[PDB]
């Protein structure tokens with residue numbers, strides 16, 4: 001067996017989600033999203049929100065192995081002249097890709113109630129919606145027309161709803177509060193290290209995945225397929241699960257800037273280059289976002305975690321087949 005064959009087999013038998021399970025899980029999310037729009041509009045009339053919408057690999061057909069999770073973005077409405085955002089590189093935290101949202105001027109904002117010390121706290125905003133999720137046990141049977149049962153998730157996932165749809169099938173939808181100031185999009189997705197957990201996170205995923213799609217659509221290439229394999233590999237072990245979709249996506253994107261030919265027969269070649277690149281970034285302790293180079297996507301990892309990942313992947317260019325096992 002060529003590495004090529006083993007890669008395609010692994011994708012087919014391990015990475016890929018059955019088209020049925022995949023489409024069905026997506027439709028569950030779509031259905032619930034539409035329901036939560038109507039209901040929460042009446043359940044929280046005072047709260048300045050845009051329409052909520054779905055986001056994540058399940059929505060993008062980049063989810064792997066099993067289809068069980070998706071984000072529901074909750075867009076806060078902010079009066080643009082009552083708030084400004086401060087990029088981390090200009091703060092004392094000095095963390096690019098993470099923002100402060102500072103309260104400004106006069107006026108009143110509904111969201112003043114989540115401001116502490118003159119800043120809109122992502123955690124305080126998150127707590128407003130932990131309340132909403134916990135309150136879901138008071139709601140009527142939403143989606144009961146399409147035989148869905150919505151339940152707050154088992155602790156400690158205080159922002160997650162559990163949706164059971166027939167039968168013994170569950171989809172986990174977490175609320176992801178978001179703010180848009182000018183053209184900067186931020187989400188309350190805590191920095192992995194707690195010190196930075198009250199900084200807002202710059203939303204990079206939509207632009208990352210759009211770039212990935214556009215590149216593959218231009219030439220029917222295999223960038224997405226190679227990515228999905230990596231994502232499923234990194235879901236295989238505890239060690240490798242410290243690697244993220246975003247990190248792997250940007251590994252691919254960087255490699256795409258160097259390699260134009262992503263024909264399906266080049267998959268094994270690209271997979272090794274991807275591993276190679278991944279090892280270099282880990283060696284350097286730096287993986288810059290392809291779309292915003294100022295942002296090091298490895299900056300939520302401790303240097304030891306980074307060294308251990310490097311160790312975990314040390315023999316991968318010469319025993320790659322081992323990752324598929």
Ligand SMILES: Nc1ncnc2c1ncn2[C@@H]1O[C@H](COP(=O)(O)OP(=O)(O)O)[C@@H](O)[C@H]1O
Nearest residue numbers: 055056057062063071187189203204205206245
């Ligand atoms: N619009 C968005 N902006 C920023 N982050 C997002 C957005 N949608 C989802 N995310 C985040 O991206 C991560 C999931 O990325 P994803 O590609 O779904 O990886 P996986 O398939 O491994 O779950 C989650 O931590 C989630 O909070």
